[PDB]
Amino acid sequence: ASRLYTLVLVLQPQRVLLGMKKRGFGAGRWNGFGGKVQEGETIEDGARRELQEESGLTVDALHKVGQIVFEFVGEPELMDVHVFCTDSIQGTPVESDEMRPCWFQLDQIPFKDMWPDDSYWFPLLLQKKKFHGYFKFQGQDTILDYTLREVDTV
Numbered sequence: 001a002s003r004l005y006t007l008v009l010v011l012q013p014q015r016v017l018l019g020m021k022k023r024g025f026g027a028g029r030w031n032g033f034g035g036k037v038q039e040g041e042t043i044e045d046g047a048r049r050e051l052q053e054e055s056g057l058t059v060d061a062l063h064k065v066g067q068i069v070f071e072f073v074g075e076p077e078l079m080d081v082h083v084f085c086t087d088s089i090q091g092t093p094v095e096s097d098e099m100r101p102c103w104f105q106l107d108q109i110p111f112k113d114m115w116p117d118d119s120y121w122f123p124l125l126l127q128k129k130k131f132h133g134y135f136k137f138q139g140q141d142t143i144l145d146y147t148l149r150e151v152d153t154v
């Protein structure tokens with residue numbers, strides 16, 4: 001019982017792009033860009049579409065870097081999140097009524113204002129490592145348990 005979601009990180013040699021979500025699920029947190037995958041759409045095509053819709057950026061090369069399964073205790077549907085990375089983008093990030101993008105230096109990642117699991121796998125993403133993770137949450141702020149491992153193939 002799961003649903004597909006995408007998560008895209010624009011990671012350049014000295015900075016990473018994150019977006020502050022204004023409303024709905026995850027509002028008030030910085031995260032990468034993404035969302036649900038459409039019927040008849042590949043996961044990578046959904047990731048590209050969502051990056052454009054939310055950041056205003058155009059991407060050509062997306063690299064699969066991780067898969068994270070999120071469970072919220074008491075919620076039947078697991079979130080199967082496919083994580084992607086890109087260093088090659090076109091355009092400038094756009095602020096909209098749904099999203100406020102901002103560039104962060106790699107030593108200034110705003111972990112206190114991100115989902116709490118990010119503190120675990122973001123250091124792997126920064127060291128160009130690929131991973132599989134599972135995080136069990138009680139509400140939106142508490143990690144009850146988790147698994148996280150580096151993989152060669154996502």
Ligand SMILES: CN(C)C(=O)Cc1ccc(-c2nc(N)nc3ccccc23)cc1
Pocket residue numbers: 005006007008021026031032033034035036070079081115116117118137
């Ligand atoms: C704006 N985005 C990226 C989405 O709407 C899809 C989505 C939403 C939330 C999460 C997510 N990210 C992280 N880092 N931690 C989470 C913890 C629990 C649930 C979702 C989480 C991933 C993709």
